[PDB]
Write a protein that binds this ligand. Structure first.
Ligand code: MG
Ligand code: MG
Ligand code: MG
Ligand code: MG
Ligand code: MG
Ligand code: NI
Ligand code: NI
Ligand code: NI
Ligand code: NI
Ligand code: NI
Ligand code: NI
Lengths: 104, 107, 104, 104
């Protein structure tokens, strides 16, 4: 019967190419991915949001809090700039779930 | 680990009433149907695939019982409310509902 | 492209008809639904498993721990009787998630 | 509230590493992945089943019908050998969806 296709952006980008987001390790590569994600996709997928949360918590795990601050500040800018409420809510979720691991 | 909760609007509403024949979350009559519709587009910021597909089924069930008259109203109502949203997710949800309904109508 | 349909058993049963499972309030009605679910369906759906967990936590909420014990003991029997690992795992998940709410 | 985690096996294996299954191109690599998937996982995920269907259709796309026959014959053996009905049904779905693309 009728169906919708939920395509993971980060799965595609990883398929096209140690804390990494869709394979990207360096901050300039990571911000290129996040820019393409936020500006190209209209509805962020749960999988992709959770893949970003894992990247951030992996940064916390390897104590690279410098990169984490850059990643969060960049996402804050782009996602809060968005006219779409889904991207505003996606940021709150990412932030709230990162804060929890930081506060441990 | 971290998680998101995808709650079905029409499942909730069917639990609150529920059922009375073609229905949307239990609602059979147009005036109770446009009401469940009314409440969905207006409250929910991100529509769920389940709810979108529950609407498509209702519409195709109308086509099935040849109630093309009620179907005209149901689509005409959603065409009104969904197209007039600022959120792209609701614009895309309408295209999907329409495109899938048109296919069955065009048969 | 190709796709799979996840069909909710409890949604169907509710459609065909204050703590309730697919509309059923009385224990004899609830055990009839659970019997039909476990003995009729080959692969339990996440939605249906979570709909059972909600019913069980709603019982805890209205302090009807008598009904809850009957519901769990009945599901233990039927789901552990199953040859299919999916039904065995579905029970563990329901039990583990009910214990959490009981322990609160 | 209560939740289930659907972890993609092939996403994990691709993350740990032109037609490929989770990065694996050569048949011995592909059969190693399929063996670990079928023998390690109790309930196959929709995403992973659809990732296998995409690999087979990608083989059809590059006209490598030799590799496709090896992949299907191997999956037939392992998935039909399984005690779990979910794996028997997963094979039928993969085969039926491959036949559709072959019939085009
Ligand atoms: Mg917040
Ligand atoms: Mg269209
Ligand atoms: Mg346990
Ligand atoms: Mg399953
Ligand atoms: Mg077949
Ligand atoms: Ni279908
Ligand atoms: Ni979790
Ligand atoms: Ni439902
Ligand atoms: Ni499709
Ligand atoms: Ni939760
Ligand atoms: Ni994935």
């Amino acid at each position: 019967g009728p169906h919708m296709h939920k395509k993971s952006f980060f799965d595609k980008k990883r398929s096209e190419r140690a804390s990494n987001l869709a394979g990207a390790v360096e901050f300039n590569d990571v911000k290129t991915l996040l820019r393409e994600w936020i500006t190209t996709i209209s509805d962020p997928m749960e999988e992709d949001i959770l893949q970003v949360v894992k990247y951030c918590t992996d940064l916390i795990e390897e104590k690279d809090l410098e990169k984490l601050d850059l990643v969060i500040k960049y996402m804050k800018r782009l996602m809060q700039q968005s006219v779409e409420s889904v991207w505003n809510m996606a940021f709150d979720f990412i932030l709230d779930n990162v804060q929890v691991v930081l506060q441990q």
